[PDB]
Amino acid sequence: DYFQGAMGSKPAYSFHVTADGQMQPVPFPPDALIGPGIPRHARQINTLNHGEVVCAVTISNPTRHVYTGGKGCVKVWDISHPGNKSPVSQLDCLNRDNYIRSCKLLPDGCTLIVGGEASTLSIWDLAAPRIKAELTSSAPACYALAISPDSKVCFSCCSDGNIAVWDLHNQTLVRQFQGHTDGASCIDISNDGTKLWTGGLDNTVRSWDLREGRQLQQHDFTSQIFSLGYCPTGEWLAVGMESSNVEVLHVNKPDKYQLHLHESCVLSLKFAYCGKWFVSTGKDNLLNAWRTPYGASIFQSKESSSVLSCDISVDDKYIVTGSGDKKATVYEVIY
Amino acid sequence: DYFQGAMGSKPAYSFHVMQPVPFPPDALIGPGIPRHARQINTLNHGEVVCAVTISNPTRHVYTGGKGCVKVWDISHKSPVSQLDCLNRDNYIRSCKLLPDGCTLIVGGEASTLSIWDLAPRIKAELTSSAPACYALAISPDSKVCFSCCSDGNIAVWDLHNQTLVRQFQGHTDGASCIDISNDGTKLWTGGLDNTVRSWDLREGRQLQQHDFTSQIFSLGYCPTGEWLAVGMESSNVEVLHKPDKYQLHLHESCVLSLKFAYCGKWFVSTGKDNLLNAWRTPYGASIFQSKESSSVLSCDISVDDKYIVTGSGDKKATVYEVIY
Ligand SMILES: [Ca+2]
């Protein structure tokens, strides 16, 4: 009621690419920009003044605290207390000169795993925050992390291209997926939890079988991959490119969609938990919300600087973004 | 060139009477609902275009400026013909074509309505005691022409006989706009006296009288019926049902003109604030907005709802192709 929808238009930006070289503008279905579970808009409700570029952001479950990863540390913010202007906690994880690149909360929300420009991954106990343990790898840096559905394993995208598989229980490296010839930049797990998908600076996206430990598919692109996400309801994989394109690949199938609403690198992306829509962030200061899988533009938010990272809450009610302007922004998704 | 929709949002601008309107699922999307209005032609009239009309079938556009109506062929950038007034200083305020398209009625700041034969020269002249004509309306049977006089009276002219048959008096100030209900038995008008009135095409006198704090500049009756949109000197647009109406706020200045799409599912309004706004019938969801270079004083929509033409303060008219 506070805000009302108003339709806009743009030159064709969403295309469907067939098996053969053939691009065609997508005819948006009746529920492309409106419908159950589809956001009407997003309202900025908080700004978290980290003071360093925020390369990683995560939100707690229940939603009350936001974790921002900057240089050397992760700051914890209590967003359930509007008046707060400073963090309630600060986790020193790496050298004050090294940047945090990824931080992930375990399914239960009692542990946080932090990785970045260093050979060690820190595991923090968030129970009534202290360093619980550390995972030391031979790779110089970690660019992204993923936690297995059963919370027993942590996958780490290494700067050397390898994907490390860590057994959290005994802090041991049980497996290593080799393939990427350049750093692995992003990762996600299929909805059935049997497959892993990674993106790399070697211009490839690779799928891996977790119960076997071998590469299944490989998609080669014209530019580097910086982000990706697997649709929670399956069938689709969204990929953010340095070329500025967002590619939504049809798992196993030929066809795909190509989305063009970023003028620069797509640094991060995340699917809503319902899978009906997703967001991408870019070096061009834009946060774009897209309908799954064809990419109808649901909403756009222009921030003050590059948007390097993002996360969405488990109930799809909040979006947090990390900024080149040394802060994080909290948005409430309005339906 | 292909275009695609992109959803946006704005602070509450549509109200039901003042409670924000809960836009239905088909408020901004649906068959017959525009997705984009593409500017395809600029008609350089040379004078402020206070009046515009489109032929049926769509082919020729007529723009009325100061002492001259120009004809443009949009089925193919300069005028294909033009109709000059005795005094090149007489500002034209309205021009309507008859169903066939071989006759154009021109009215304006003059004491005479000019009937032009487009099969071109003045076929006849209808002189009135009133100082000027601010708006014209043709009856469905195309045998009668209603003229809004600057004195407030509504002159009824028998086209074939070229004679004044009657008048509807009431407006303290000259009437500025008019339209006929979908049934064709009721007449609705608005005046510079800050009033909107309704008349009977049989009895001959006023029926309803509405209150407004500003001069009404435009009016439109929904083709499919049931609704009536009004534009005021203020900047508001209201869709009347009877009680229960809607109020729309997206103009920063006077609402100079308004026109319903023939399917009636949507309509447009123009303002001195350089905006062409498209609204969903009847609650007023914003379908699209176009910011022009100057004031938009007039508009028309083709009978096939495929084109919109606007008259501008920058001495030109703009042709838009409606993209569905
Ligand atoms: Ca681009």
Query: Do B219 and B233 touch, CB atoms closer than 8 A?
Result: no
* Residues A126-160: b if buried by 16+ CB within 10 A, e if exposed: beebeebeebebebebbbbbbbbeeeebbbbbbbb
Q: Exposed e or buried b for every residue in B152-171, given b needs 16+ CB within 10 A? A: bbbbbbebeeeeeeebbebb
In this complex, the residue of B10, B288, B289 whose CB is nearest that of residue A3 is B10
Contacts of B185 (CB under 8 A, 6+ apart): B200, B201, B202
Q: Measured between alpha carbons, how far is A28 from A155 in angstroms, rounded to an integer?
A: 37
- State the best of A1, A2, A3, A4 to mutate against chain B, taking most chain B CBs within 10 Å: A4
Q: What is the DSSP string of A156-177?
A: EEETTS-EEEEETTTTEEEEEE
Between the CA of A294 and the centroid of ligand 1 the distance, in Å, is 16
Pair B135, B120: CB distance under 8 Å: no
Residue A238 near residue A228 (C-beta atoms within 8 A): yes
Note whether A13 and A32 are within 8 A (CB): no
User: Element (H or E) spanning A320, and its range?
Assistant: strand A318-323
Bin B46: left if φ > 0, else alpha if -120 < ψ < 50, else beta: left
- The residues pairing with A153 across neighbouring beta strands, listed in sequence order, are A167
Compute the C-alpha angle B60/B63/B65, nearest 5°. Answer: 160
- Residue B214: closest CA among B152, B186, B178, B256: B256
Return the bridge partners of A297, or none. A290, B6
At CB < 8 Å, which residues of chain B contact A?
1-14, 19-23, 25, 27-30, 35-36, 285-289, 323
Cα–Cα nearest to B138, from B179, B176, B174, B181: B179
Ligand 1 centroid to residue A242 C-alpha, Å: 10
Cβ–Cβ < 8 Å for B307, B58? yes
Of B247, B165, B255, the closest CA to residue B219 belongs to: B255
> Ligand 1 centroid to A260 CA: how many Å?
5
Tell me the one-letter amino acid at B101. G
CA dist., res. B7 & res. A261, Å (int): 13
Q: Which two tokens stand for residue A4?
A: 């009302």
Place of tokens 């009302």: A4
DSSP character at residue A71: B
Question: Closest approach of chain B CAs to the CA of A293, in angstroms?
Answer: 15
Half-sphere exposure for B299 (CA within 13 Å, toward CB): 31
DSSP state of A99: B
Q: Which two tokens stand for residue B303?
A: 């009978």
Nearest to A9 among B14, B20, B35 (CB): B35
Distances (CA, A) of B303 to A226, B57, B143, B284: 51, 8, 20, 21
**CB–CB of A330/A45 below 8 Å?**
yes
**Among A4, A32, A33, beta carbon nearest to B13:** A4
CA-CA distance, A118 to A116, in Å (whole number)? 5
Distances (CA, A) of A126 to A62, A91, A111, A113: 13, 11, 5, 11
Give the SS3 label for residue A234.
coil
The amino acid sitting at A257 is Y
Closest CB to A7 among B2, B28, B323: B28
Q: A141, A119 in Cβ contact below 8 A? A: yes
For tokens 């723009």, the residue is B63
Beta-strand relationship, B206-211 and A236-241: unpaired
Domains of chain B: residue spans and CATH: 1-324 (2.130.10.10)
Q: B94, B39, B88: which is closest to B62 by C-alpha?
A: B94
Ligand 1 centre distance from Cα of residue A232 (Å): 26
* Partners of B210 in beta bridges: B196
Between CA B91 and CA B312 the distance in angstroms is: 14
Determine contact, residues B241/B250, Cβ cutoff 8 Å. no
**Strand A56-59's sheet: what is its strand order?**
A56-59, A65-69, A73-78, A89-92
